Amino acid sequence: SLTERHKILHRLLQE
Amino acid sequence: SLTERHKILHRLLQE
Amino acid sequence: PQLSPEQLGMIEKLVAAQQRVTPWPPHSREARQQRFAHFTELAIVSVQEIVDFAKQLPGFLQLSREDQIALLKTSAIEVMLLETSRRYNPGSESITFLKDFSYNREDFAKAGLQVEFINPIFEFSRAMNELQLNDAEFALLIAISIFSADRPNVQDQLQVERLQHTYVEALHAYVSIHHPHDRLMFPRMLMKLVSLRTLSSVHSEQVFALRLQDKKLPPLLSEIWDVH
Amino acid sequence: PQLSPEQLGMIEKLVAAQQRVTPWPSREARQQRFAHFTELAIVSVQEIVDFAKQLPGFLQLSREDQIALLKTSAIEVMLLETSRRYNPGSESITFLKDFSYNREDFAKAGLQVEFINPIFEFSRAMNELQLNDAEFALLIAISIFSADRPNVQDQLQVERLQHTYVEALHAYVSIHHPHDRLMFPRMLMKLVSLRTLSSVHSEQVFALRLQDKKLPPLLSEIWDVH
Ligand SMILES: CC(=O)N(C)c1ccc(OCc2ccc(C(F)(F)F)cc2C(=O)OC(C)(C)C)cc1
Ligand SMILES: CC(=O)N(C)c1ccc(OCc2ccc(C(F)(F)F)cc2C(=O)OC(C)(C)C)cc1
C-alpha cells in the first residue's frame, strides 16, 4: 500500500 | 536555432 | 456564449481540414523489428498530417517558422494521443489505426513500448471515450494543444496565447450548443489537456528507455523526440 | 452561471482555512541553504495536509486515496503558493512574510537552472492574471482533486468532487470578472502548465541523487522513487 510507505504523511493526516 | 536542428520538420512546413 | 459567424466558419474549416506503410505481420528478430517499423511509420504519417493540419489553422503561418517548429515539436505527441483516443473502441479495449486494423495493449507491447507508457495511454483513451467528443470538439482541442504559450523556446508567447484563447472561446460557444443542459462539458475537455502533459512527460520516459535498449528512432521522430 | 449559497459558503470556508527554521546565512553554507529551503517545504506539506482535511469530500475518501492525491499534488500546490508570493518589481518570492528570494537565492539553495527558470516564468504569468484568495484556494482544490494521479482507486468520486470546485470557480469568476469570460479558462489553463512543472521537478529530485544531496524523510517519502 501507499499508506505503509508514507508513514509521516499518514501521521499528519491522523493528527 | 530550432530550425537548424529540425530539417525534416522545416521541409514539411515549406512544402 | 453565442457562437458568432466568424467562429462558425473557423470551426467548419478545421473539421474539413481533418478529412503505403510497412505491414503488420513466430516471435523472431524480423518480427519485432517490423512491428516497431510499422508503429513508427504510422507516427511519421501522423506528423505529416499534423503539419498539414497546423498550416490550415488561422494564425499559425503568420507566426515565425522557428515558433511554428517550437509549437509542433512538443505538441506532436499530444495531438497523436488525442487522435489515438478518438479511435478507441470501448468494447474490445483497442485502437483502430489506418481504418482497418485494431491494436490492444499487448499489440502496443509487441510494437516495442514499455508497460508504464501503455496503461496511461489506455486509461486516458477510456476517459476521453466517456466524454463522447465529436469531430469539431476534437479539432478545437488539437488547436488549443498546438497553440500552447508555455512550450520550450517559444519567442512570441503573447500572440500564441491570444490565438489559443480564440479557439477556447470557440470551444465554449460550440459546447453551449452541443450540451446546453451540461455546463461542465466545456471545462471537462480543458481538464483533459492537463492529463495530456503528464502523458507527454511519460512519453519522454519511453524515448529515454529506447536509448538504453538501443532501439533507434527513424530520422523524423528522432529530431522531434530525442535529446541531443 | 450564478453562485449558489452552498457554493458561497464552501468558498469562504476555503479562504478561512488558508488565513523555528534553519537560519539563512564554503561547502558548509551550501548545505545549510539547502537545509533551510527543504524545511520550508516540510512546513508547506503540513499546511497542505491541514488545508486538504477541511475540503468537502476529502476525508470521506479512503486514506490510501488521500495519500495518492496529496503525494503528487503537493508540488503543484507549492508552485501555486510560490506564484501567490511573487513580486513583479523585485523579481523575487517572499517566504514567511519577511525575506525575499530571487533566482540566484534559489541557485544558492541547491536548485538547477532547468528548474528555476520555469518556476519564475510560471509565477510571472500567474501574476499577470491577478488572482484572489478565493481563486487561489479553488485552484489548489482542483489540483488536489485530480482523478488522473497515479494509484487512485475511486477515480469517479475524485473527478465528481473536482467538478464541484470547477463550477464554483466559474460562478465566482463571473462575479469577479463579469466583462471577461476568458478569465475562468485562463486559470484552468495554468493547471496544464503545472504538470510540466511537476515533471521538471521530477528531474530536479533525480539530479539530487547524482550529486548525493539527500532529502529529509517527509520530502523523501513523497518525492523519491525508491
Ligand atoms: C493516431 C493515429 O491515427 N496514428 C496513425 C498514430 C499511430 C501511432 C503513432 O505513434 C506510434 C508510436 C510509435 C513510437 C513511439 C515511441 F517508441 F517513440 F515511443 C510511440 C508511439 C506513440 O507514442 O504511440 C501513440 C499511439 C501515439 C500513443 C502515432 C500516430
Ligand atoms: C510557498 C511557501 O510558502 N513555502 C514556504 C515554500 C518554500 C519552498 C518550498 O519548496 C522548497 C523546495 C525544496 C527542495 C526542492 C527539491 F530540491 F527537492 F527539489 C524543491 C523545492 C521547490 O520545489 O521549490 C519551490 C519554491 C516550491 C518552487 C515549498 C514551499
D226–A8 C-beta distance less than 8 A:
no
Counting ligands in written order, which one lies closest to the CA of residue D216?
A: 2
In the chain, the amino acid numbered C181 is H
User: What backbone torsions phi and psi does residue D23 show, to the nearest 5 degrees?
Assistant: -65, 145
Residues of D in contact with A4 (CB under 8 A): none
Instruction: Please say whether the beta carbons of C155 and C67 come within 8 A.
Output: yes
Q: In terms of Cα–Cα distance, which of D47, D42, D39 is closest to D23?
A: D39
Cα Dmax for chain B: 20
C-alpha cell at C130: 466517456
Helices (H), chain C: 5-17, 29-56, 65-86, 105-110, 115-131, 135-146, 157-178, 185-212, 219-225
Query: Which residue, among C50, C220, C227, would best test binding to B if mutated, counting the most B CBs under 10 Å from its CB?
Result: C220
Which single residue is written with the C-alpha cell 481540414? C17
Residues of C in contact with D184 (CB under 8 A): 187
Region of residue D110 (left: phi > 0; alpha: psi -120 to 50; beta: else): left
Q: Which residues pair with C70 in a beta bridge?
A: none
Q: How was this structure determined?
A: X-ray
Partner C contacted by B11 (CB < 8 A): no
Instruction: Please say whether the beta carbons of C97 and C137 come within 8 A.
Output: no
Residue C80, exposed/middle/buried by CB under 10 A (0-12, 13-18, 19+)? Answer: buried
Instruction: Please say whether the beta carbons of C99 and C157 come within 8 A.
Output: no
Indicate the helix (H) or strand (E) that contains D92.
strand D92-95
3-state secondary structure of D94: strand
- For C129, residues 6+ apart whose C-beta sits below 8 A from its C-beta are C85, C88, C90
Q: In terms of Cα–Cα distance, which of D216, D85, D61 is closest to D147?
A: D61
Q: In terms of Cα–Cα distance, which of D191, D96, D203 is closest to D138?
A: D191
Instruction: Please say whether the beta carbons of D174 and D193 come within 8 A.
Output: no
Measured distance CA(C208)–CA(C192) in Å, rounded: 25
Resolution of the experimental model in angstroms, please?
Answer: 2.7
Residue-range domains of chain C with CATH: 1-228 (1.10.565.10)
Q: How far is CA D139 from the centre of its chain?
A: 9
In the chain, the amino acid numbered D36 is H
